[PDB]
């Protein structure tokens, strides 16, 4: 786990053989990570949309471990001010908002 | 409630005598709402920082009801692509991430 929100909800993840940190972001539809070299197929995707769009590489069905939970989901790879775990992967780990 | 994340976590809020909807956004430090006329004192605040800054009005200790929970917190008022409830108000309502 139960994560209170007094601080930014940053968690450890394992992706593409690397250990990284990312922000659990319920405001983000998608997961965007930078500086990961993923194997297998990808397609370009345009995201954002304020001031223009940002092009990232979309990798589907990527195995990823998030705070000890081994799951699968789409990961967008490209430049991002902060590594973000979006709703698409929070659903996979069974993460809910509770109050 | 327990809110799953398959859809965007949009909730009803009551602010400044108006009913509005806003997104529960764990990636946002602050709460930003547009088209509200709040009474009492404010100061300008610069937020964002990508491409420049956005100037908003900071109102402290604003009474707000969020999905039935009457709380108090800082509300930034200015144009925002989507009304956002940030961590500052999620802590007030006792909202946690759970998995």
């Amino acid at each position: 786990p139960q994560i209170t929100l007094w601080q930014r909800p940053i968690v450890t993840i394992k992706i593409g053989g690397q250990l990284k940190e990312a922000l659990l972001n319920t405001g983000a539809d998608d997961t965007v990570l930078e500086e990961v070299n993923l194997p297998g197929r990808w397609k370009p995707k345009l995201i954002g949309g304020i001031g223009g769009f940002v092009k990232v590489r979309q990798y589907d069905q990527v195995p990823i471990e998030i705070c000890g939970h081994k799951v699968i989901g789409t990961v967008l790879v490209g430049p991002t001010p902060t590594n973000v775990i979006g709703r698409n992967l929070m659903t996979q780990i069974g993460c809910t908002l509770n109050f | 409630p327990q809110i799953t994340l398959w859809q965007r976590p949009i909730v009803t809020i009551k602010i400044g005598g108006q009913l509005k909807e806003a997104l529960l956004n764990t990636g946002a430090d602050d709460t930003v709402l547009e088209e509200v006329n709040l009474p009492g004192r404010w100061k300008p605040k610069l937020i964002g920082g990508i491409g420049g800054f956005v100037k908003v009005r900071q109102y402290d200790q604003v009474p707000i009801e969020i999905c039935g929970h009457k709380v108090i917190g800082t509300v930034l008022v200015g144009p925002t692509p989507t009304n956002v409830i940030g961590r500052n108000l999620m802590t007030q309502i006792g909202c946690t991430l759970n998995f």
């Binding site: 954002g48 001010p81 979006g86 | 946002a28 692509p81 956002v84």
Partner: peptide, 7 residues
């Protein structure tokens, strides 16, 4: 910071 998104 402050981070929503739409794909």
């Amino acid at each position: 910071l402050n981070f929503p998104i739409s794909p």
